[PDB]
Coordinates of C-alpha atoms in Angstrom, one line a residue:
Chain A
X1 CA -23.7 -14.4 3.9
X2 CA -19.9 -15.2 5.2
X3 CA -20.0 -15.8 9.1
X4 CA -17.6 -16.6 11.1
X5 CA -18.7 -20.8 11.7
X6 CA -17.8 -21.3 7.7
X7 CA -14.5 -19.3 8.5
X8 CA -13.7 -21.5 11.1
X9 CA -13.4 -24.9 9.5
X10 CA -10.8 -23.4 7.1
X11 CA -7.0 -22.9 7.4
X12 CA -5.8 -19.4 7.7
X13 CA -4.9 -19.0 4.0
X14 CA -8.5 -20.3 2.9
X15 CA -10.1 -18.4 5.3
X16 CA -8.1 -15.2 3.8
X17 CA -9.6 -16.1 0.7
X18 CA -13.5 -16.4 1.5
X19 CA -13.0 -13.0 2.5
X20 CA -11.4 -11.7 -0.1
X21 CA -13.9 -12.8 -2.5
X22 CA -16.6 -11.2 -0.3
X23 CA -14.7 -7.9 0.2
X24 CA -13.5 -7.5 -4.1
X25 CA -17.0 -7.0 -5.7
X26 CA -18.1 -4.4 -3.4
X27 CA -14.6 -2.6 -3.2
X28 CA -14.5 -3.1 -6.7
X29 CA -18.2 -1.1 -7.0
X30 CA -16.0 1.8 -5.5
X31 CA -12.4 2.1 -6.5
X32 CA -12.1 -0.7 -9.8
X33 CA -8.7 0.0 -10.6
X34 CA -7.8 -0.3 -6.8
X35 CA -10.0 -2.9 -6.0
X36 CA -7.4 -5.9 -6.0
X37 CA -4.8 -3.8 -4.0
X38 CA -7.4 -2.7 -1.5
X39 CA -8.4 -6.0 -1.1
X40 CA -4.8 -7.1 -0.2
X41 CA -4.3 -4.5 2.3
X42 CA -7.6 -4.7 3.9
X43 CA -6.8 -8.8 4.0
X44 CA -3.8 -8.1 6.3
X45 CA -6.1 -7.1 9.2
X46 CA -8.0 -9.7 11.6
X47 CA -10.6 -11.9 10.4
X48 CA -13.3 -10.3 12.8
X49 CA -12.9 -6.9 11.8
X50 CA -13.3 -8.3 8.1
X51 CA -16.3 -10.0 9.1
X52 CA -17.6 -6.6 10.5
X53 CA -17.1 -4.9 7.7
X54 CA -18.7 -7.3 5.2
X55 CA -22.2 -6.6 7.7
X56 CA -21.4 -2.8 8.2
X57 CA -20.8 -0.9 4.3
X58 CA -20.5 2.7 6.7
X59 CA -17.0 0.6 8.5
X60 CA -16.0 -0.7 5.1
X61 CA -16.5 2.5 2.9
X62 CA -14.3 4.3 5.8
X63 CA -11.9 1.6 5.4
X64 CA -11.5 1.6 1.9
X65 CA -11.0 5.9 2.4
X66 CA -8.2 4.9 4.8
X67 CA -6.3 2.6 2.3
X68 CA -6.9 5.4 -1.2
X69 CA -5.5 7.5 2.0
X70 CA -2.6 5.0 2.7
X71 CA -1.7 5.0 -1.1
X72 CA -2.0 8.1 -1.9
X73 CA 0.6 8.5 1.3
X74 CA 3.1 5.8 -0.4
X75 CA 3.2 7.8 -3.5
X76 CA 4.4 11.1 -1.7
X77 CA 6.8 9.3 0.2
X78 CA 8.2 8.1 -3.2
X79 CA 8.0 11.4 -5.0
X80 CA 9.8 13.2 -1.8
X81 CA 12.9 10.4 -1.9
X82 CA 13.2 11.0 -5.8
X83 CA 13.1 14.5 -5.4
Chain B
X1 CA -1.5 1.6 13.2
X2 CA -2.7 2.2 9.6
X3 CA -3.0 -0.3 6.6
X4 CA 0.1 -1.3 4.8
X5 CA 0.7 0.3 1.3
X6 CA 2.7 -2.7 0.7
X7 CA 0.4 -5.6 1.2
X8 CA 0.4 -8.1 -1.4
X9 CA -2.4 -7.1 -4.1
X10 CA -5.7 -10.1 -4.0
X11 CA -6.5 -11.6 -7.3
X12 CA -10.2 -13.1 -7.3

C-alpha cells in the first residue's frame, strides 16, 4: 500500500512515478490498450487525489470513464477540423 | 476542468 509518508521523501518526478506504477495494473485490468495513456493523463492531477483513488476503485473507475470520455472528445474534435 | 487528452502517455 502507497501512502503519502513514502511519497513524501521523493522528488516530484519520482513521486509521479510510484503512482503510476500503482495506478497501470488496475487501469490496465479495465482499458489495456488505454492503460498507458490513461495513466499519463490521470498523472497530471495532484498527488492526493491519486492517492485517493488508489484507496477508493468507485473514484478511480469514474476517473478512468472521464478520460475514455476525454479521448473519445479529442478524436471528434479532430474528425470535425478534417472535415 | 477535465483531464488533458494530451498528457504525455506513462510507460511502466
Amino acid at each position: 500500500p502507497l501512502t503519502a509518508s513514502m511519497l513524501a521523501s521523493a522528488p516530484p518526478q519520482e513521486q509521479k512515478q510510484m503512482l503510476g506504477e500503482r495506478l497501470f495494473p488496475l487501469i490496465q485490468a479495465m482499458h489495456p490498450t488505454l492503460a498507458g495513456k490513461i495513466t499519463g493523463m490521470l498523472l497530471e492531477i495532484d498527488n492526493s487525489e491519486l492517492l485517493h483513488m488508489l484507496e477508493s476503485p468507485e473514484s478511480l473507475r469514474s476517473k478512468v470513464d472521464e478520460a475514455v470520455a476525454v479521448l473519445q472528445a479529442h478524436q471528434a474534435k479532430e474528425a470535425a477540423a478534417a472535415a | 476542468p477535465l483531464l488533458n487528452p494530451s498528457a504525455l502517455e506513462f510507460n511502466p
